[PDB]
Amino acid sequence: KTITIKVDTFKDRKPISPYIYGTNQDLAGDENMAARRLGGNRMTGYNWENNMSNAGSDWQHSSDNYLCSNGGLTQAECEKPGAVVTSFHDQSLKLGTYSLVTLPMAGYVAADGNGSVQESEAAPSARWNQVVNAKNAPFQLQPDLNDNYVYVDEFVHFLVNKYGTASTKAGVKGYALDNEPALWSHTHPRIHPEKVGAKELVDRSVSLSKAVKAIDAGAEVFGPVLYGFGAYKDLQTAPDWDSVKGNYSWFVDYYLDQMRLSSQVEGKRLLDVFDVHWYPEAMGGGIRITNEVGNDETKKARMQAPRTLWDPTYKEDSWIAQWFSEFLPILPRLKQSVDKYYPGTKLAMTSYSYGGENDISGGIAMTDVLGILGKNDVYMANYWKLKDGVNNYVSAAYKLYRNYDGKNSTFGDTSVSAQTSDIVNSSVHASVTNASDKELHLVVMNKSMDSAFDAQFDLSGAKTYISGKVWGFDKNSSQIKEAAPITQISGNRFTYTVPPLTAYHIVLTTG
Ligand SMILES: OC[C@H]1O[C@@H](O[C@H]2[C@H](O)[C@@H](O)[C@H](O[C@H]3[C@H](O)[C@@H](O)[C@H](O[C@H]4[C@H](O)[C@@H](O)[C@H](O[C@H]5[C@H](O)[C@@H](O)[C@H](O)O[C@@H]5CO)O[C@@H]4CO)O[C@@H]3CO)O[C@@H]2CO[C@H]2OC[C@@H](O)[C@H](O)[C@H]2O)[C@H](O)[C@@H](O)[C@@H]1O
Ligand SMILES: [Ca+2]
Ligand SMILES: [Cl-]
């Protein structure tokens, strides 16, 4: 089998935001990430004053010191106000990453670390302190531990006092408006038992965003942090949706337009980044790809699923493709809405996973997804660990892009056109840096479970590429190994065999 691949370094150049190399949980530590997020269900009820938070439906609706544990804080460090967040951001500073920090909006945060909160102990109660967005009183760097309040702008002031503003090298750059609000009543019923309203969500968002922007106008505000397509569609059947939907195609549009309107009235941009989560509903062999590695058909579906992000020709097996295919592929659809209803707003996928964490199918899916995100105008993207412990093949995909040689060498910063004759069995992504005519980066993969192909590359560039080095991973080894070089290239064409279930990063030089 031969496939032909055409790369034109002059064509479709566009910047790849480095923050697409991003994560929630830190992985092995040698992925050379550019962005880190402190978010997810635990952050909704996180109390900065004492570092306590609540698991919600994930664990017993338990209030406890988990986030201190997770961040590696000592018992003594866990007593210091803001320590989970400052320890997190100190690590970002050390690693050179963007920090995105979630702020609370569901309305209360954990008052203690005394464990499960029963139904009748729902907020307000002794187990909860109330969130107030703007203190309207002198800020304290040592907040009042004895009252019933946590003030969000006081916390932002605390961060700015320590690190400077977002516009500075050391500042915390992004803040998120809580986490998965259409799931508050399911995940955090002890905090917000009623289903969130569409108007409610906008009002809470405008109030919190104003408070933040009053402390740091340069910080980027991310919202609405939607869990998945049911929330994109109608905010999980929000009780007021029929009353507010007017002529909107989906809640995505209502939110964008209402945030744009509120920003007008306020005289400042209140939404910087439109923030979604995306866990594929794609099925294969009777199994959702995010649930477990699955069988051969689950593995095949996992590697094809990234096409739902971009490819108009691809129809996955899911309830979304079944009943809502006019909203797919998802990235161009989201971009269409953002550009129309709040021009200039960025797009982020702040929690996602394709599953198969320790399977070559998971590695290849992610090697495709990182290429796709980079060249589809996504500002920031953060993997979420659905499986605890090592996620060897996810880490492999990041390292293939960001530390392929053990020296933190990376894919280029500029996407360029790469086309393949077979979009089912292969995917391919190309890049240069600063319009280089010296070095060209190609990430290529074979998704076939059974059949190698010979990839015949045809390159267009200003100079003649003369040789290449190759690194890769496959089903036998998740570590990125050096592969046989490309020792002779003639007239900017060369052939390289890609075995089944293999991903390579090829680096061509002029020289
Ligand atoms: O870790 C991430 C995050 O996960 C959360 O869990 C969520 C699951 O991941 C997710 O799969 C689940 O999705 C379901 C949606 O909640 C649900 O609304 C959706 O309903 C679909 C039907 O599946 C579909 O058949 C139906 O089709 C209709 C069609 O609409 C109609 O036009 C036509 O005429 O008829 C068709 C056939 O009848 O359409 C509806 C939507 O319209 O199904 C999804 C798959 O099951 O959501 C999970 C969260 O849901 C929970 O919380 C909210 C409640 O509303 C749900 O009841 C509850 O189960 C974790 O919960 C979260 O903690 C975590 O962070
Ligand atoms: Ca307090
Ligand atoms: Cl949501």
Short mmCIF file of C-alpha atoms in Angstrom, two decimals, residues 174-464:
data_model
loop_
_atom_site.label_atom_id
_atom_site.label_comp_id
_atom_site.label_asym_id
_atom_site.label_seq_id
_atom_site.Cartn_x
_atom_site.Cartn_y
_atom_site.Cartn_z
CA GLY A 174 -6.35 33.13 33.15
CA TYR A 175 -9.38 32.70 35.43
CA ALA A 176 -12.30 30.37 34.75
CA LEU A 177 -15.90 30.98 35.76
CA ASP A 178 -16.36 27.83 37.89
CA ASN A 179 -16.74 24.42 36.17
CA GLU A 180 -19.58 22.69 34.30
CA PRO A 181 -22.50 24.84 35.56
CA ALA A 182 -25.18 22.70 33.79
CA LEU A 183 -23.93 19.87 36.02
CA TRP A 184 -23.96 21.83 39.28
CA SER A 185 -27.27 20.22 40.30
CA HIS A 186 -25.91 16.75 39.61
CA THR A 187 -22.25 17.02 40.72
CA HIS A 188 -22.73 19.62 43.46
CA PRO A 189 -26.33 19.33 44.70
CA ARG A 190 -25.19 20.27 48.22
CA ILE A 191 -24.10 23.65 46.81
CA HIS A 192 -26.69 24.39 44.09
CA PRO A 193 -29.51 21.75 44.11
CA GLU A 194 -31.66 23.49 41.43
CA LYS A 195 -30.79 23.20 37.73
CA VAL A 196 -28.90 26.36 36.72
CA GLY A 197 -30.87 28.86 34.57
CA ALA A 198 -29.56 30.32 31.31
CA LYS A 199 -30.17 33.88 32.53
CA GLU A 200 -28.89 32.91 36.00
CA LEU A 201 -25.63 31.66 34.48
CA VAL A 202 -25.12 34.89 32.50
CA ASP A 203 -25.89 37.04 35.55
CA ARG A 204 -23.50 35.08 37.82
CA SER A 205 -20.85 35.28 35.09
CA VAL A 206 -21.15 39.02 34.56
CA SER A 207 -20.98 39.69 38.30
CA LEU A 208 -17.88 37.51 38.84
CA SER A 209 -16.11 38.69 35.67
CA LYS A 210 -16.61 42.35 36.64
CA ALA A 211 -15.13 41.71 40.05
CA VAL A 212 -12.06 40.02 38.59
CA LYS A 213 -11.48 42.59 35.84
CA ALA A 214 -11.64 45.34 38.51
CA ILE A 215 -8.51 43.82 40.05
CA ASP A 216 -6.73 42.74 36.86
CA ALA A 217 -8.08 44.02 33.55
CA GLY A 218 -5.50 42.02 31.60
CA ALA A 219 -6.47 38.61 33.05
CA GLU A 220 -8.32 36.37 30.57
CA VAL A 221 -11.76 35.19 31.73
CA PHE A 222 -12.83 31.74 30.49
CA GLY A 223 -16.48 30.61 30.37
CA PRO A 224 -18.88 28.90 30.55
CA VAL A 225 -16.74 25.72 30.98
CA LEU A 226 -19.53 23.54 29.53
CA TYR A 227 -19.36 19.80 30.24
CA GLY A 228 -20.43 18.51 26.83
CA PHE A 229 -22.90 18.71 23.99
CA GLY A 230 -26.10 18.63 26.08
CA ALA A 231 -24.94 21.82 27.77
CA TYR A 232 -23.79 23.38 24.45
CA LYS A 233 -27.31 22.69 23.08
CA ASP A 234 -29.64 24.10 25.79
CA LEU A 235 -27.69 24.18 29.00
CA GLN A 236 -28.94 20.66 29.88
CA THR A 237 -32.60 21.66 29.39
CA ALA A 238 -32.28 24.78 31.57
CA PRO A 239 -35.69 25.63 33.09
CA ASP A 240 -35.76 29.04 31.36
CA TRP A 241 -34.41 27.90 27.97
CA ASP A 242 -37.76 28.07 26.12
CA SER A 243 -38.29 31.60 27.44
CA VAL A 244 -34.88 32.94 26.34
CA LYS A 245 -33.92 30.90 23.27
CA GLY A 246 -35.57 33.34 20.83
CA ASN A 247 -33.95 32.67 17.45
CA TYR A 248 -30.72 31.15 18.80
CA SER A 249 -29.53 27.85 17.33
CA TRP A 250 -28.18 26.72 20.70
CA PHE A 251 -27.14 27.94 24.16
CA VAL A 252 -23.58 28.59 22.86
CA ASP A 253 -25.05 31.51 20.83
CA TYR A 254 -27.23 32.84 23.65
CA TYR A 255 -24.24 32.94 26.01
CA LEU A 256 -21.92 34.61 23.49
CA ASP A 257 -24.47 37.26 22.56
CA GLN A 258 -25.48 37.93 26.18
CA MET A 259 -21.84 38.22 27.32
CA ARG A 260 -21.21 40.58 24.38
CA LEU A 261 -24.25 42.68 25.41
CA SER A 262 -23.26 42.75 29.07
CA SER A 263 -19.71 43.76 28.08
CA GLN A 264 -21.13 46.70 26.11
CA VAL A 265 -23.11 47.93 29.03
CA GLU A 266 -20.13 47.54 31.36
CA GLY A 267 -17.68 49.16 28.91
CA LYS A 268 -15.19 46.28 29.09
CA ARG A 269 -14.77 42.79 27.64
CA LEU A 270 -16.12 40.31 30.24
CA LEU A 271 -15.45 37.09 28.28
CA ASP A 272 -12.06 36.41 26.71
CA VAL A 273 -12.20 32.69 25.96
CA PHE A 274 -15.18 30.49 25.20
CA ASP A 275 -14.42 27.39 27.23
CA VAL A 276 -15.83 23.87 26.61
CA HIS A 277 -15.13 20.30 27.74
CA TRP A 278 -15.26 17.47 25.19
CA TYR A 279 -15.38 13.79 26.08
CA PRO A 280 -16.13 11.90 22.85
CA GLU A 281 -19.41 9.98 22.82
CA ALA A 282 -17.96 8.00 19.89
CA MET A 283 -18.63 4.27 20.16
CA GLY A 284 -16.93 1.19 18.74
CA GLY A 285 -17.53 -2.49 19.48
CA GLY A 286 -20.35 -1.51 21.79
CA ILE A 287 -18.13 0.65 23.99
CA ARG A 288 -17.74 4.42 24.46
CA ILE A 289 -14.07 5.25 23.75
CA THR A 290 -13.66 7.24 26.95
CA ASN A 291 -14.96 4.41 29.19
CA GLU A 292 -12.35 1.67 28.67
CA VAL A 293 -9.78 0.57 26.08
CA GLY A 294 -12.34 -1.80 24.55
CA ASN A 295 -11.92 -4.32 21.73
CA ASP A 296 -10.54 -3.93 18.19
CA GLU A 297 -13.56 -1.98 17.05
CA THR A 298 -13.37 0.33 20.10
CA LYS A 299 -9.67 0.93 19.31
CA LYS A 300 -10.42 1.67 15.64
CA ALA A 301 -13.22 4.06 16.63
CA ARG A 302 -10.88 5.79 19.11
CA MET A 303 -8.39 6.55 16.33
CA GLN A 304 -11.08 7.83 13.91
CA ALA A 305 -12.89 9.92 16.56
CA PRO A 306 -10.60 12.95 16.19
CA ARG A 307 -12.23 13.46 12.75
CA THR A 308 -15.40 14.66 14.58
CA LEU A 309 -13.36 17.74 15.49
CA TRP A 310 -12.73 18.86 11.86
CA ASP A 311 -13.87 16.56 9.06
CA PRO A 312 -17.23 17.35 7.37
CA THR A 313 -17.29 13.84 5.87
CA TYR A 314 -17.06 11.92 9.12
CA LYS A 315 -20.06 10.59 11.02
CA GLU A 316 -19.12 8.86 14.24
CA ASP A 317 -21.39 6.39 16.10
CA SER A 318 -22.87 8.51 18.93
CA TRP A 319 -26.15 10.14 19.99
CA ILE A 320 -24.63 13.48 18.99
CA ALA A 321 -23.93 12.40 15.37
CA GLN A 322 -27.27 10.58 15.40
CA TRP A 323 -29.51 13.48 16.41
CA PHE A 324 -27.37 16.63 16.10
CA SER A 325 -25.04 16.11 13.12
CA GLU A 326 -25.61 19.69 11.93
CA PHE A 327 -23.42 20.75 14.86
CA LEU A 328 -20.56 18.56 13.60
CA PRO A 329 -17.70 18.80 12.99
CA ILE A 330 -17.44 20.53 16.29
CA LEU A 331 -14.50 22.92 16.03
CA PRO A 332 -15.66 24.73 12.91
CA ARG A 333 -19.15 24.89 14.38
CA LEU A 334 -17.96 26.45 17.64
CA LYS A 335 -15.75 28.86 15.73
CA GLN A 336 -18.69 29.88 13.50
CA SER A 337 -20.67 30.80 16.62
CA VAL A 338 -17.83 32.61 18.37
CA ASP A 339 -16.98 34.69 15.29
CA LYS A 340 -20.63 35.66 14.75
CA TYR A 341 -21.86 36.36 18.28
CA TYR A 342 -18.81 37.68 20.13
CA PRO A 343 -16.12 38.48 17.59
CA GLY A 344 -12.55 38.25 18.83
CA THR A 345 -13.38 35.77 21.60
CA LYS A 346 -10.94 32.78 21.69
CA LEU A 347 -11.81 29.08 21.96
CA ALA A 348 -10.47 26.55 24.51
CA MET A 349 -11.07 22.86 25.13
CA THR A 350 -10.11 22.81 28.83
CA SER A 351 -10.93 19.21 29.66
CA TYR A 352 -10.96 16.28 27.22
CA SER A 353 -9.68 12.74 26.65
CA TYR A 354 -9.97 10.06 23.98
CA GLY A 355 -9.42 7.22 26.47
CA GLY A 356 -7.08 4.27 25.75
CA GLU A 357 -4.55 5.93 28.07
CA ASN A 358 -2.19 2.97 28.13
CA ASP A 359 -2.96 1.68 24.61
CA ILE A 360 -1.39 2.57 21.28
CA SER A 361 -4.92 3.56 20.08
CA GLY A 362 -4.96 6.31 22.74
CA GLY A 363 -1.50 7.51 21.71
CA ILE A 364 -2.37 7.71 18.04
CA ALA A 365 -5.70 9.44 18.72
CA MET A 366 -3.85 12.11 20.71
CA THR A 367 -1.09 12.50 18.18
CA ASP A 368 -3.83 13.32 15.67
CA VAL A 369 -5.78 15.58 18.12
CA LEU A 370 -2.78 17.75 18.98
CA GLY A 371 -2.13 18.35 15.23
CA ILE A 372 -5.80 19.09 14.65
CA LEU A 373 -6.16 21.52 17.56
CA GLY A 374 -3.04 23.36 16.54
CA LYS A 375 -4.30 24.12 13.03
CA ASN A 376 -7.99 24.74 13.79
CA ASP A 377 -7.65 28.03 15.70
CA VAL A 378 -7.88 26.56 19.20
CA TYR A 379 -6.21 28.81 21.75
CA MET A 380 -5.79 26.38 24.65
CA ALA A 381 -6.51 22.71 25.35
CA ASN A 382 -6.03 20.70 28.55
CA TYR A 383 -6.07 16.88 28.71
CA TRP A 384 -7.97 15.33 31.65
CA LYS A 385 -6.91 11.98 33.18
CA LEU A 386 -9.95 9.64 33.11
CA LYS A 387 -7.68 6.86 34.43
CA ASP A 388 -5.44 7.32 37.44
CA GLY A 389 -1.72 6.41 37.59
CA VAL A 390 0.42 6.46 34.44
CA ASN A 391 -1.18 7.34 31.09
CA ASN A 392 1.78 6.15 29.08
CA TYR A 393 0.45 6.57 25.54
CA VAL A 394 -1.07 10.02 26.20
CA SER A 395 2.29 11.15 27.56
CA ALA A 396 3.90 9.63 24.43
CA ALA A 397 1.72 11.79 22.16
CA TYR A 398 2.70 14.98 24.00
CA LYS A 399 6.38 14.03 24.02
CA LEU A 400 6.24 13.29 20.28
CA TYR A 401 5.22 16.96 19.75
CA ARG A 402 7.10 18.62 22.61
CA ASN A 403 10.07 16.53 23.74
CA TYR A 404 10.80 14.06 20.99
CA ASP A 405 14.53 13.87 21.61
CA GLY A 406 14.83 14.13 25.42
CA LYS A 407 16.05 17.71 25.01
CA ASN A 408 12.60 19.33 24.82
CA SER A 409 12.84 19.80 21.05
CA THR A 410 9.40 20.56 19.64
CA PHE A 411 7.08 20.72 16.67
CA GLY A 412 7.21 24.09 14.93
CA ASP A 413 5.16 27.14 15.88
CA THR A 414 3.70 27.59 12.43
CA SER A 415 1.27 25.05 10.89
CA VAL A 416 1.68 24.50 7.16
CA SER A 417 -0.39 22.57 4.63
CA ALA A 418 -0.09 18.77 4.78
CA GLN A 419 -2.50 16.65 2.74
CA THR A 420 -2.74 12.86 2.58
CA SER A 421 -4.39 10.65 -0.04
CA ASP A 422 -5.90 8.45 2.69
CA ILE A 423 -7.53 10.20 5.63
CA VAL A 424 -8.82 6.94 7.14
CA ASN A 425 -5.58 5.01 7.51
CA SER A 426 -3.27 8.00 7.98
CA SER A 427 -3.08 11.47 9.46
CA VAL A 428 -0.30 14.00 9.00
CA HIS A 429 0.57 17.43 10.38
CA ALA A 430 3.36 19.74 9.28
CA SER A 431 5.05 22.79 10.74
CA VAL A 432 8.00 25.17 10.56
CA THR A 433 9.23 27.88 12.98
CA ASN A 434 9.56 31.60 12.06
CA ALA A 435 8.95 30.66 8.38
CA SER A 436 12.06 28.47 8.46
CA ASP A 437 13.49 27.31 5.20
CA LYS A 438 16.12 25.34 7.26
CA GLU A 439 14.00 22.82 9.21
CA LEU A 440 10.63 21.12 8.52
CA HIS A 441 8.64 19.07 11.06
CA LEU A 442 6.22 16.31 10.04
CA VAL A 443 4.12 14.20 12.42
CA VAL A 444 2.67 11.20 10.58
CA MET A 445 0.71 8.21 11.82
CA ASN A 446 -0.71 4.89 10.63
CA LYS A 447 -4.10 4.10 12.22
CA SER A 448 -4.38 0.70 10.48
CA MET A 449 -4.29 -2.19 12.91
CA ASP A 450 -3.04 -4.60 10.21
CA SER A 451 -1.32 -2.92 7.28
CA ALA A 452 1.87 -0.86 6.83
CA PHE A 453 1.99 1.75 4.12
CA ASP A 454 4.81 3.42 2.23
CA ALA A 455 4.29 7.19 2.58
CA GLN A 456 5.58 9.01 -0.49
CA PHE A 457 6.24 12.62 0.58
CA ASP A 458 6.30 15.50 -1.93
CA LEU A 459 7.70 18.70 -0.34
CA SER A 460 7.42 22.33 -1.49
CA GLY A 461 9.92 24.71 0.07
CA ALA A 462 12.34 27.53 -0.66
CA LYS A 463 15.39 25.30 -0.21
CA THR A 464 16.19 21.67 -0.91
#
